[PDB]
Structure 1
Amino acid sequence: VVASKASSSMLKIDQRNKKLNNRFIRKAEMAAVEKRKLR
């Protein structure tokens, strides 16, 4: 393929952002559901 440097950088950014989203959004949702449950 011989990918460009900008495209490879964007791919690395996308992988990091996907991992960070999958952690943080799931943790926030768990905190919200436990708070709604304890009420």
Structure 2
Amino acid sequence: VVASKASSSMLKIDQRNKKLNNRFIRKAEMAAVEKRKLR
């Protein structure tokens, strides 16, 4: 394929952002559900 530099950078950014989202959103949801439970 020989992808361009911009496309490779975008792929790396996408992988990092996917990992960060999968971590942070799940953590925030877990934090919220326990508070909603104890109320």
Same fold (TM over 0.5): yes
Gaps of 5+ in 2: none
- Unaligned runs of 5+ residues in structure 1 are none
Name the % identity.
100
Query: Quick one: distance in 2 between partners of 1:25 and 1:18?
Result: 10
Give the alignment's TM-score, normalised by structure 1.
Answer: 0.98
Q: CA deviation at 1:5?
A: 0.2
Aligned length: 39
Once superposed, which parts of structure 1, at least 4 consecutive aligned residues long, lie more than 3 Å away? none
- For the aligned residue pairs, the C-alpha RMSD in angstroms reads 0.3
Instruction: Give TM-score, length-normalised by structure 2.
Output: 0.98
Displacement of 1:36: 0.1
